[PDB]
């Protein structure tokens, strides 16, 4: 249950998310649920005049945005990228998860 976290947007879809973050500062982010899909979360982040979106995959016992860095929970994953730039897995996205969208 992540509803307490200022970065958690619940079941928000892409259009709403884009419309919301496009007006925010680079580094503003949210995690949203994708109930229908095999990847049931996405991270969305404002970066250099665009809103970028990253699939969060659950496979076997773990959760990840890249199979090269696997976590035991969504919270651990989010807290990792709060302090470690996304660029270690996406060049062209050199920012941390810097500002939760509700902050």
């Amino acid at each position: 249950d992540y509803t307490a976290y200022p970065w958690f947007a619940g079941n928000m879809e892409r259009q709403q998310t884009d419309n919301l973050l496009k007006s925010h500062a680079s580094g503003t982010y949210l995690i949203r649920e994708r109930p229908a899909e095999a990847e049931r979360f996405a991270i969305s982040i404002k970066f250099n005049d665009e809103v970028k979106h990253i699939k969060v995959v659950e496979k076997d016992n773990w959760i990840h945005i890249t199979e090269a860095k696997k976590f035991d929970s969504l919270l651990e994953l989010v807290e990792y990228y709060q302090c470690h730039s996304l660029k270690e897995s996406f060049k062209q996205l050199d920012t941390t998860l810097k500002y939760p969208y509700k902050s």
Binding site: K52, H53, T66, F90
Partner: peptide, 8 residues
């Protein structure tokens, strides 16, 4: 142009 960031 991909909808979600491509993982290299």
């Amino acid at each position: 142009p991909p909808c979600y960031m491509d993982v290299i």
